[PDB]
Amino acid sequence: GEIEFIESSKDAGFPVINTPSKTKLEPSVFHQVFEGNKEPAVLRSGDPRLKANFEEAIFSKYIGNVNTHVDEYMLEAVDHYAGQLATLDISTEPMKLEDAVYGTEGLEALDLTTSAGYPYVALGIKKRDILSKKTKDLTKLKECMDKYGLNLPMVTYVKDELRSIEKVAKGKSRLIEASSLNDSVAMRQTFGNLYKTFHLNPGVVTGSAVGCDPDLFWSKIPVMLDGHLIALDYSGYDASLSPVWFACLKMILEKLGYTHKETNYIDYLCNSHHLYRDKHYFVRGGMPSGCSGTSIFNSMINNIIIRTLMLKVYKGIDLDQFRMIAYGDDVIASYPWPIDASLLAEAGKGYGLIMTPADKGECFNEVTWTNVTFLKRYFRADEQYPFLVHPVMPMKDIHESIRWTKDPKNTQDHVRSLCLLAWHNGEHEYEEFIRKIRSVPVGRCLTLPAFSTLRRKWLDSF
Numbered sequence: 001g002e003i004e005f006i007e008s009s010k011d012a013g014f015p016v017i018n019t020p021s022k023t024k025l026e027p028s029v030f031h032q033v034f035e036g037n038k039e040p041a042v043l044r045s046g047d048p049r050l051k052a053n054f055e056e057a058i059f060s061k062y063i064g065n066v067n068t069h070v071d072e073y074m075l076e077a078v079d080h081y082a083g084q085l086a087t088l089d090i091s092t093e094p095m096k097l098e099d100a101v102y103g104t105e106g107l108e109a110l111d112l113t114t115s116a117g118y119p120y121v122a123l124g125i126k127k128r129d130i131l132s133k134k135t136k137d138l139t140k141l142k143e144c145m146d147k148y149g150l151n152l153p154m155v156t157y158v159k160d161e162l163r164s165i166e167k168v169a170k171g172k173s174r175l176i177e178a179s180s181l182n183d184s185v186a187m188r189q190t191f192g193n194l195y196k197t198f199h200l201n202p203g204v205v206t207g208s209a210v211g212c213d214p215d216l217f218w219s220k221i222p223v224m225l226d227g228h229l230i231a232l233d234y235s236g237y238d239a240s241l242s243p244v245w246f247a248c249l250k251m252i253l254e255k256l257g258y259t260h261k262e263t264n265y266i267d268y269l270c271n272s273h274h275l276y277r278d279k280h281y282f283v284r285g286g287m288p289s290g291c292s293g294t295s296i297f298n299s300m301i302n303n304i305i306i307r308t309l310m311l312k313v314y315k316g317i318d319l320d321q322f323r324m325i326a327y328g329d330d331v332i333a334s335y336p337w338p339i340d341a342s343l344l345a346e347a348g349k350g351y352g353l354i355m356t357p358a359d360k361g362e363c364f365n366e367v368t369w370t371n372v373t374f375l376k377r378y379f380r381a382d383e384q385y386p387f388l389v390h391p392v393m394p395m396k397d398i399h400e401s402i403r404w405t406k407d408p409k410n411t412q413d414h415v416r417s418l419c420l421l422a423w424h425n426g427e428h429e430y431e432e433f434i435r436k437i438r439s440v441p442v443g444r445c446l447t448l449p450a451f452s453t454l455r456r457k458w459l460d461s462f
Contacts, residue, residue, distance in 0.1 A: 001062050001239045001286020009280045014153070015122045016278045023160050024406040029442045034399040038162040041173040050171050057171030058158060061239035065285045066352035068244050070251065077307035078248055080319045081300075082255040084205050088197050092257040095192030101185060102136045106196030106211075109133070110188065115178035118153045118275060120144075127181060145182045151268060152180035154288055156276040162400055176290035177274065187265050187292035194256075198296050202325070207303040209327040210295045214377055214391035215420075215458060222369065222379065222389060225323050227334040229367040230306075232341050235354040237329030238287040238298065242352045246270040246285070248304045249297060269297065289328075298328035305353065306331060309344040325374075332374045340364070380424070388462065390424040395433070398422050402437075415446055423454040430454075 009016060023040035045054045070078075095104070103109035112127045120126070130140045159174040167173075179187070188195070199211035204224045209217065234240070250263045269291060272283045287294050287301075306324055310317050317335075324333035341364040345355035357364045359373055369379055378392040398418050405414060415437060423430045430451050437443040 001241055002064050002284050003059060003062050004282050004284050006279055006281035009275060009278050012280055014275055014280050017121060017155055017275050019157055019277060020160075025160065025162065025404045026406075026408075028403055028405040028408065028411070029440050030437065031403045033436050033439055034403050036400040036403045037165055038400045039165070039168055040404070041159060041161055041163045042168055042171050043158050043160060043173065047171075049168050051169040052171045054171040054173075058173050058175055060172070061175075061236040062283065062286060063236065063240050063354070064352065065242040066244070066350070067242065068351070070244060070247050073308045073311040074244070074248050074304065075251075076311055077304050077319075078252050078255070080307055081207065081303045082252050084207065085252070085256060087205055088201060090197045090256055091193040092259075092262065093193060094189045095196075097138055097185070097189060098136055100188040100192045101131065101138065101141065102133065104192075104196070106200040107188070107192055110181075110184060115155060115157065117155045117178040117180040117183075119148060120181060121155055121178075130181065141181075141185065145185065148180070148182055150180075150182055150186050152183055153273045153275050153280065154179055154291065156274045157290075160406075162404060177272075177288040179288075179291040183265075183268065184292045190262055190265055191293055195293060195296060198299075204323045204325060206299075207324050207326055208296065208299045209325050209330075209375070210299055212327075214375060216461060218377070218379060218389040218391040219387065219462070221325065221332070221374070224325070225332065225334040227321070227323070227336040228338050229369070229372055230324075230333040230335060230339055230341060230344075231331065231358040231367045231372055232345055232355050232364070233358055233360070234329045235356060237302075237353070238289045238294070240353055241285055241287050241301065243270055243285045244351070245301050245305065249301050252300065252304065266297075269294070295328050299326040302326040302329065302331055305348070305351070306333060306344075308351070309347045310335075310339070312347050313343045314339070327375055330374060332372065341367075385459065388459070391421075392424050393421040395422065395425055395429055398433070411442060412446055415443075415448065419449055420454070423449075423451055427451050 021044040023043055025040040042050055042054055047054065101110050110131065112131060112133065115121060116125060116127045130144055131137065154177040157176050157178060159176050198206050198208050202209045202212040202217055203220065246266055246269065250266050253263045253266065254260065269288055270285060272288050274281050274283060287298050303324060303326060307319055310319065310322065321336050324331060345364070348355040358367055372379060376393060376397065380390045380392050382388040382390060398421055402415065402418055405411065422433045434448060437446070437448065
C-alpha cells in the first residue's frame, strides 16, 4: 500500500478529528511486583521518549506497491484455495440486517464500544445514540444510512497498547482504521454469512483461525498440520499489500458466487480515504486494519499468497498435500517434504511482501513443534493426555500485561483472564504467579481460580 495524496483537512472542509493524545494505560498495583520492559505506545508527536519522528514512523508501514497483473501462480493459488472454500457452501445471500447488527450464531453483535467513524465522530453521535442492544432498533440506523450513504472516509486512530522499548523509541505505533458505521453495517450484510462460516470453521479448510478458542483449537492443529512445519513472519503485512492481492481476493470471492457488484467493497478496502487528526489522505493498496472483516480478508489473502510462493519456487508442488492456517498475517503450515522458507521469503519480496524467519529468528531455522508459535503461543502436549495440547502464552507476556491497566475497576476480570493463560505454563509457574499477585493487598481481594479447577475444566471441555 502507498499514500498517494495527503493534505490539511480544512482545505477540503473536513473538521479536525479530536482523538486522545494521552494513553489510558497506567501502572497497575502489580507494576512493582512483576518485571516488564513494555510501555504504552507513543500517541503524540512531542512524546519525550521518542528517538525518531513520530508522523514518519506511524506511516512508514506504507512501503509502496508492486504493480503486477494476476499471474499464473496467483491464478492457480486462487483456484486451489477456492476449491477448498466451495466445500463449505458459503451463502452469498445478504445477511438480514438485525442479524448483521445485533448478533447471530458465528457473528457477534457490532461492537457498540468502538468508534462510529465519520461523520458521526464530528457530530458527537456515538454508536449507542443510534443502536440499542435491549431494543434492537434499526430505525435510527436506517435513517443514518439513508442520510449519509456509503463509501465514507475512514478515521485513523493510533492504537493505545503496550510496546517494546525499541518500538516506543522508534515511534512505530500501530494504526487502526474506523470504518463509518454505515460501511461496517453494509459490509456485515454483504459478507456476514462468509464471516459466520469462517468463524464456525477454524482449520485447514478455511485456512483460518479467526475466532478460534486456543484452549480447544490447539489440540486440533497438529492433527491438521501433518507434515514438516512451515512458519515465517511478515513485517507490516497489512500495509505492504499491493492492489494485485486484492484483485486475487476479488477473483476468489467471485468464484464463491459473489457478483462483481458485491465485491465492490473490496475496492473500498484497497483504495481508501482517511482522516487523521487534522490531515486527510488517500491510500492505494494496504489492508485498512480495523475495518469490517479485515482479519478474515487478511487471512484469505495470506492463503493465496503462500500458495502463490510455493507454486512459483517449487514448480511441481502438490498443493493437495499442503495445509495451512492463518490469523491475518500469522501463518502456520505444513507439507510432507522439507521446504526452504528463505526461498519463499525472497519470492515474496518480489511481490512487495516483507517476510522473515519465524519469531524474529536469525535464520530460517528448523521449525519444530517445540519452537513454533501461533497467536504468540507455543504448543506443549499435556504430560498425561498426550493428545491434548496446551496453548502456552509465555509468562513474560503475561507479566507485561498485568503491570498496566486502562481501568483498575476491571482488575478482577483482567487478572482472571491472565490466570486462564498462565496455568498452561505448569503448576509451579502458576503458583508463583498467584503468590506474587497475592503479595499485594488487592491480590488477596481477588477471586482467583485454583490450578486444579483450571486443569479440570480444560480436560472436561473436550
